[PDB]
Amino acid sequence: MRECISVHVGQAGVQIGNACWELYCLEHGIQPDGQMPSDKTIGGGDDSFNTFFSETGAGKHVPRAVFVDLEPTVIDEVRTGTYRQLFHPEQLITGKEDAANNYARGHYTIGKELIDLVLDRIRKLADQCTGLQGFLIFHSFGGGTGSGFTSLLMERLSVDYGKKSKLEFSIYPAPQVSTAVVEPYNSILTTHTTLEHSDCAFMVDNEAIYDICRRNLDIERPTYTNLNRLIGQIVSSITASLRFDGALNVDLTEFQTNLVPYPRIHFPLATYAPVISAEKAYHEQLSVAEITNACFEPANQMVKCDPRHGKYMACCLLYRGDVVPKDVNAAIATIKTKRTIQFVDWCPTGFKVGINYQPPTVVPGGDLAKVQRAVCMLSNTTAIAEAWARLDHKFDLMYAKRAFVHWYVGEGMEEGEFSEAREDMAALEKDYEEVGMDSV
Amino acid sequence: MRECISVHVGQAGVQIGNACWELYCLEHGIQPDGQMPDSFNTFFSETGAGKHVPRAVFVDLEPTVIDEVRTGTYRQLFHPEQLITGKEDAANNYARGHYTIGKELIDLVLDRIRKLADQCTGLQGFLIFHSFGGGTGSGFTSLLMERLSVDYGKKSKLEFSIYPAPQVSTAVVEPYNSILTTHTTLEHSDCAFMVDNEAIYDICRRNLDIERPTYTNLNRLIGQIVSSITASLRFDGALNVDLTEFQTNLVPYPRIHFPLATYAPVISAEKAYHEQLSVAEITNACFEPANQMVKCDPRHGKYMACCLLYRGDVVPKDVNAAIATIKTKRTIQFVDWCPTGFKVGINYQPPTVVPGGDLAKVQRAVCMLSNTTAIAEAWARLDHKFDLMYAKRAFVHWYVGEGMEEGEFSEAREDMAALEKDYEEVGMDS
Amino acid sequence: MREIVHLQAGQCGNQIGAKFWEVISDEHGIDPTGTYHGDSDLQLERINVYYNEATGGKYVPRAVLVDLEPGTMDSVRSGPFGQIFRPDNFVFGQSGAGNNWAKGHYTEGAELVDSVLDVVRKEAESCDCLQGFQLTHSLGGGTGSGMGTLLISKIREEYPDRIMNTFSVVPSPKVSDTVVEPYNATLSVHQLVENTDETYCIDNEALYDICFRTLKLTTPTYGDLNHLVSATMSGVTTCLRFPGQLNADLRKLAVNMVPFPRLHFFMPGFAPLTSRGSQQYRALTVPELTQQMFDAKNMMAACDPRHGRYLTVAAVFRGRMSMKEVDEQMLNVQNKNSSYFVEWIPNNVKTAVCDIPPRGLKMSATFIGNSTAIQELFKRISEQFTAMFRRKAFLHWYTGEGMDEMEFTEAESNMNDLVSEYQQYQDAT
Amino acid sequence: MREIVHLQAGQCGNQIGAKFWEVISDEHGIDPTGTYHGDSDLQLERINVYYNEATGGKYVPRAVLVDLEPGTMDSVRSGPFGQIFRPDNFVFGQSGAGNNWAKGHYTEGAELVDSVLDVVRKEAESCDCLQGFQLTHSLGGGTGSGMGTLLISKIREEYPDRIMNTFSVVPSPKVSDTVVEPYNATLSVHQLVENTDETYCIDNEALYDICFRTLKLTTPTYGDLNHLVSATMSGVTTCLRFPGQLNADLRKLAVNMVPFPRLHFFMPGFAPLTSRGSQQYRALTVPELTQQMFDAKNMMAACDPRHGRYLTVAAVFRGRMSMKEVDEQMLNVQNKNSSYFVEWIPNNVKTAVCDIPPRGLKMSATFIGNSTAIQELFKRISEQFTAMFRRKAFLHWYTGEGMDEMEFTEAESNMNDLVSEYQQYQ
Amino acid sequence: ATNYSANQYEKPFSPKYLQNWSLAKPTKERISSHEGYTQIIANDRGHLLPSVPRSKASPWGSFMGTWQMPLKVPPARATLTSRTAAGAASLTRWIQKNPDLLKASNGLRPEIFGKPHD
Amino acid sequence: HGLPFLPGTSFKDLTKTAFHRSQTLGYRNGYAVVRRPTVGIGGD
């Protein structure tokens, strides 16, 4: 039971998938060639891997993942790497020519070309699950296939699968740095068309994770390998109440009902507290209440917007390690007494707790410390209403002179979809306003 | 007892019968010189000299295909009169293959079948292998099935055929032949399973990783479908299926006898390592349009009947559970007047790997023979290309001048123009 | 002295017959060659209910195996107990049936019914006081349904006072193992309703569900479903074979069961069936046989008796037990559950008690229920039959051997009137 | 003869209900395998109240373990007492609730209610004289509160004059372990008003205020907080199982507690718990069990009776003590401190003496008290419902199953009535 | 075809219980009765008769492809509560103006539960 | 050692590092399969 079908899309999605699936192989017993070291028990000893790994007859475990891209050069070091024998070859879908930072190329022209091939592969992985909790989506708004085809993945998921839970992690574009020039046209048009189709949507951006690896860990110059390692330690802590023994269990269904109050507002923000270096855990005792306070800290946040600008609509705390169910209570009661955190008026209950026994795993040659307790957090805040205002700013900028609009009009797409998907977002800017008013 | 007489007509019949009979020698113990170093009686017949000789008749009008059989490896296995050759071929012509050249050789094949029907005690029925495109596979074959009916009666006449492909084709004059033989066998044939060469090209490219295949990679896949149809007359099973069981469960109307063919767990030996091949995984992949053997899509029409032929290490509940998942999906949609739908058959002998072959060694298998309304495009596209050339009388002098009146072009186009309406109205609601 | 002649038709009847004769040979201590190797002396007293005696102490069964081709009786001979059946009791033809009721009834089965009648008349004129005949067959094929009903009609025109008893594998509701089932199912139900004295209804979905939720077999086979059918087959005829404190034969079960002549289709069940490793969680007493005979997810029939009303109920017990407990529970369930029991019959349950439990158990029990909630079978078959028949769906195959067009009409009117007869006795005051 | 058929629902019920069968089994001498290895004959004389007989001299509980996803019953099966349960008793679905009441009540639970009421109907009719059921569940969750109210609703219509208890775990006043708590807990007290005979309120901070302040546990898990719930699930049901100088079954405490039928929310306690080094300092007499039943800080309900008036009182005792001394203290606490007792009942306290103490203990004592200081548990859930509800907070997760808006109106207003129904007597 | 109901045993054949996590084909809970002889609605070789009222729908079944599927597909769930009246009206009009999506074989079976705030 | 079963007599086992959980309760074709616990918590 408890199966989860991971869907990775884009070069960002593939390179995040390579980080997570190395973590999952080490977390259970799996080698890089599929096999366990021999189980040395009677029959099947441990069946904990069934949420992520299947099993053939012979003793080979094949992941429940689909790796999607439109450029061939990203999957061809998954196919000829260390983990080239773990993946069944047909799970890794490549195109022949990529979407080239166009939403329109990735939605109408090249994405429709490749949609029905990968919705045959997710049928086969969803007919192997006795109980399916829900999918996972790993994308980035910036690219063509990370925005265009990913937004059309969610739309044809809603037709076929109904009200099945479709989570998504995302790389929202950064405020100061940026890869590309055409990213506001991409990022606006996909938040408009995934808006009624997605259940939940966690966001991080790469500039904030830059601020932690340089500062909290003692690793100057972090490559994307060090950022992708931290993303796998959030996905693992979301799904470790499904595989390892817990005191309080949390599913993948208890996040949408506890952080998404209103239909247009499904945008929580991730945080992970004891990300620390091996020279500076020789000195610090990591208690249960010492790592609770450091999910609310604006430095240790994982997006480049301060929660103090807004109001905490809810929370979701994920405690992982050697904790006590009483010292979880002994820290939450403290946090509510500060006046530098401010819960919204119509949420007097606030929280959602989760306690799990298996401590977080040490990857050989990784970044962090061998730590005995940890906390993950997904919190939903009104302080994201400052993030679309820096995206309405850079859409209306290049749209009032209509730069780059010819690269989307002749690419199979009419032009009135530009001047309505920024009007559609214009209600969402006032919709985040009225939940910021107190009920006088 | 429970014998089967194969008839192979044409180069596309002989070259399939070199890869069917290589399997049957090897599935039993038979060496390629006839000696065994008692289930072979459905296909072999023991002589008093220890030497097993097959029940088959190979027919061609050209000597350059059968003289490879008479020189190759299996030259001691075949009786010298079980391989019949002419001197001039039919040359992609319906008229030569039916009237002038095929008539000088039709009276000698029925001499050979009459001897092979006098040794079988309980004969199930005949099997035909031909090609619609050729001259002898389409002209002479439509002369066998007319003369088989009056001489043998209500015996079962199954047939396999290479239907023309939607884009690729060998010849120019193939739509004149593919209409003129469908019209004249439409009342004289029982069931016609159809594969086409283009959809098997798209399986050996995609399922196996064989870029640039050859006909010998295609004749071996067809031989694994013929082997799983007669698999229950030879090996012990839990639900037997005869050769009589197929006409009664897939032919709802006497003008509608064109099913399709699908054989599910075709994989390579580098992918049998990676995946389990349970009963539900191979049942779900028969109904998948990427794995069919004609380039027609069953989602754009209504199913009419199905027939599942399981084979190997299978269990009755995994058959029953996997069917009930097919009956729940919204994409497998049935016709108004078929509420039951299915036929099942369970055998025990797992499939046999051929040395030099391509498929992996597997432990379960499914062969599905489904009848669908989605074939209505396959005749309507072929009806365009008959009409397109014949509207200004092209290639007709190659047909009138050899024993053929000209009016058989207007009536064989009138007659199949009723078949397109015939498929249309049986899927229409009430 | 009370001999029972066995008739097996079709491949379903042949495999069920092979497993059933293996069960009886185990019960009476007959080894796979034919010689008695038993323990008690009760095993050898009334062995003549099933086994004819030959010279040299060999016991040959009183069974007739019928098929339209010998492709199944090769497999019957090559089994473990294939050597005990007499070689002359196998009747076969040259050409198959082909899932065709018309070829089973008129064309091919007419040339074989004479040979089968010769064999069964030879076995019937060797019994000192014969009781009747059993037929085990399937309502989906061509040999089992067509030729089987031809045999039933020609047996009941010649021996019209004896008992005719059928075990019929009626079609399943979810998955049908033949496209053209409901034609054969209708045309066989129309014959059974005239020419049988009792008919038990068996469904394979019910057998799968019992072998998964109750016996907890991971991979059941037909070699286990046939064991379930045989174990409830040889439990309705124990009191002819073993002593007891309240005997009951098949005539007595029919007399106490069927109140009207057109209403003789029954729903079986078998009590002490229990799991593999859950033997140490369950006691084996009479209330623990009662609550499992009468459980509605235990029927072998895929019809829920809670939609309707139990016309009559029979319970056949095996073992050394107490009459107070037996009669106490068969009254107690009736008084506690009184919307599923008709009121114009004041007591509904007939109880028989035999002495010798099956070889391995302490107690056993079998249940045979006659309900007006078996009409869902006939309503579902009637609706699928009219769906195909209104459009001439497969009708040329049947019509081309001399079948009329009025025969489908009269069969569907007969089954629909039988449905209305059930509903009248459900809704009667 | 006086059988009690146990029920347990959800990830709170299957963690309360797993330790409770580890405190009864050792109380009666039952191994992990199931066999009896006892050292008396009172350990087997009246064991049929909870334990069915199995074959071979082996005993099996009447637990019906219920869940909506079986993850939280794989951990229960792998413990030290996982093989004692009959595996047919496990009820479980495929996908859970998501802490959503309607999905547990209307949508996913209702597809699993007919498989539960086969199991209880197979056990409620295998009793010689059934006394009544139980239920251990939490109001904060989705399948504890959600279908666990559908269970009481659809068995009060089939056995309508037996006993139906519930050990609730109603939510907490400081920290809430689900955001959507006041929608679930308001909508479920409204069900329990017209559907239970008794109901005990348990808050999880009042269990924390014992193991830190009183038991002195530095690291108290939920193992040592389930062990306090299961040490008062057995005090209420002891006089059934063990002989007495004065007896009290479940009905007699129900008769002597509820003056009006809408008023059936109680607050438990348990006396002789003591700290680590203070066991050698303890006096061992009878009036030091009356100190710690009645000490206003050790209730399991986080509602101080100093705000309220004791409508009635219970007391159950375990040991061989004296009937003069038990009755003397009930005269003592009623006549010193008589501003906390109602005036139109002149003796509020019901007493009962079992004889067989818990193993290792020389005496023991259990309490149940019915108060007007328990309506403040129902005020606090009201304003956190009607703050959350007047701006239509989480309602699309609930109304999107097809609910009505006026159904929230009565479950507010029925709970507003019982707030003012209790409030006459203060 | 028509699905039916194994009356006792419908729970093993429930579509989510056979690992089919999508929308599925519904079943017939109640079978209606009839009597007599059934009229042959269709003449030989499968033609429907002239005066039998044929259905208005297409003969070939309505499968909506990819290049046939409408652009800007409406959502599967749309509860209207906690919405403005004009926004809920725009959502219902979005659902309304695509009758070809909601009528297909593989069509969107939506949800409109609740009333928006006036 | 030697303690009775009272509300304050349970102690941790700090030398245990794997707390994996197994799939005993599960489904099948359509059937709620509940199979015998081979291992405990952690693979032991």
Ligand SMILES: Nc1nc2c(ncn2[C@@H]2O[C@H](COP(=O)(O)OP(=O)(O)OP(=O)(O)O)[C@@H](O)[C@H]2O)c(=O)[nH]1
């Ligand atoms: N956090 C994180 N972001 C990444 C990573 N790799 C790439 N990105 C982001 O990737 C975005 C650029 O688009 P991509 O996802 O790389 O490209 P794509 O999805 O294949 O789309 P096209 O190149 O247009 O076809 C930038 O916004 C980067 O921030 C990564 O490993 N971690």
Ligand SMILES: Nc1nc2c(ncn2[C@@H]2O[C@H](COP(=O)(O)OP(=O)(O)OP(=O)(O)O)[C@@H](O)[C@H]2O)c(=O)[nH]1
């Ligand atoms: N699958 C398969 N198809 C074949 C094979 N050989 C020929 N064909 C098909 O045969 C068609 C050409 O007609 P043939 O059957 O080869 O020639 P023929 O029947 O002898 O006709 P004539 O040469 O005029 O006497 C082509 O369309 C091919 O599709 C074969 O070995 N395997």
Ligand SMILES: Nc1nc2c(ncn2[C@@H]2O[C@H](COP(=O)(O)OP(=O)(O)O)[C@@H](O)[C@H]2O)c(=O)[nH]1
């Ligand atoms: N219970 C059971 N059913 C069987 C067996 N063999 C075949 N069947 C059933 O028989 C039906 C098909 O009828 P069939 O046996 O072919 O009839 P025949 O043509 O007379 O042999 C299907 O519904 C199968 O489920 C068996 O060994 N046991």
Ligand SMILES: Nc1nc2c(ncn2[C@@H]2O[C@H](COP(=O)(O)OP(=O)(O)O)[C@@H](O)[C@H]2O)c(=O)[nH]1
């Ligand atoms: N006493 C106790 N309370 C618990 C336990 N687990 C959760 N709770 C409480 O129960 C609520 C959580 O509901 P839960 O039972 O997990 O949801 P459910 O599984 O849907 O019934 C919160 O109020 C928790 O404080 C436990 O093991 N023991």
Ligand SMILES: [Mg+2]
């Ligand atoms: Mg790219």
Ligand SMILES: [Mg+2]
């Ligand atoms: Mg040629």
